[PDB]
Design a protein around this ligand. Sequence first.
Ligand SMILES: O=C(CCNCc1ccccc1)Nc1scc(-c2ccccc2)c1C(=O)NCc1ccccc1
Length: 330
Amino acid sequence: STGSATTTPIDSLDDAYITPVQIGTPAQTLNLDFDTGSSDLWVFSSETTASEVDGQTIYTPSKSTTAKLLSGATWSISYGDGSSSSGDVYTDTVSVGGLTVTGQAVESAKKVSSSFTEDSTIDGLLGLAFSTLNTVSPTQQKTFFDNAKASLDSPVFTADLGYHAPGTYNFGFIDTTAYTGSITYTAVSTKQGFWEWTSTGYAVGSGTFKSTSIDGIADTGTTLLYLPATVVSAYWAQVSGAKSSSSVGGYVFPCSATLPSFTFGVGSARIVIPGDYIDFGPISTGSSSCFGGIQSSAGIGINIFGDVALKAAFVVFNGATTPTLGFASK
Ligand SMILES: O=C(CCNCc1ccccc1)Nc1scc(-c2ccccc2)c1C(=O)NCc1ccccc1
């Protein structure tokens, strides 16, 4: 089997991407944020504290003839950015782009943090990291991909995120029309539960490429590119007037600037992030200070190849017995 679904930016800045997911019988379609940096499939629901729902579409398990309470199971997750959610668990039928899994754990939120409430466009998350990170207790559950994998034509999924435009998540096949050149594969460590890999270096604009190992995660659920402070300083030094603002929480730059590109290495291959991808717009409405899309990972403990990087590539998440990651230009 295979599946193929369009993923759509939630706003004009590509802050996140939502993908429609069918849950239950008859189907209830929710728009979920596919997150290769976490491993829980959770949704706003008929159980979510009413004051914490503001415009989201909810899953109502009592209206699904295939829903079953997973007795005694609870979940609770904290994200790297401080947001959180928690609740109880059903199993139900879940379909993405024509690919169906029966008995998928659907984590129903009883509580969500304010950042989730405040984003009416995201109805929940669909985790695509390794199932070792799943938070369901006392019996840890599998991701959608892990449940689907044996049925897929090939044990892979691909992320093809657009810049200011829709893109695609495919399951079970590689669309050879969706990228240029060849796909370069690179080793993955699953030790921390992530799609963790090592970039071979970087360049800023038309500058010379610096060979250096940068260990980080391929994370579709993180907006920005978080890299070591040395790399990030070298980037922003090429933008007149850019500075790190402790009050804003990262590098800002004049909105009148034209940003240089940023290149990262994948083995001997190179992925170029155009400068425009690195502009996240005014820090507040009407300001002429704009927020940068490349930020330091120094406070985080891990480098993160988030959407800013991934949307410059066609990315293969290869879930073979020894997982690997592939990147192609597009
Ligand atoms: O990049 C983001 C925000 C993603 N949503 C963007 C958005 C912006 C405006 C409006 C609506 C949505 N957070 C970061 S920054 C760094 C991390 C992180 C990830 C893993 C480990 C450590 C830190 C994260 C992070 O925790 N990402 C997972 C996540 C996914 C969705 C919601 C909440 C957390």
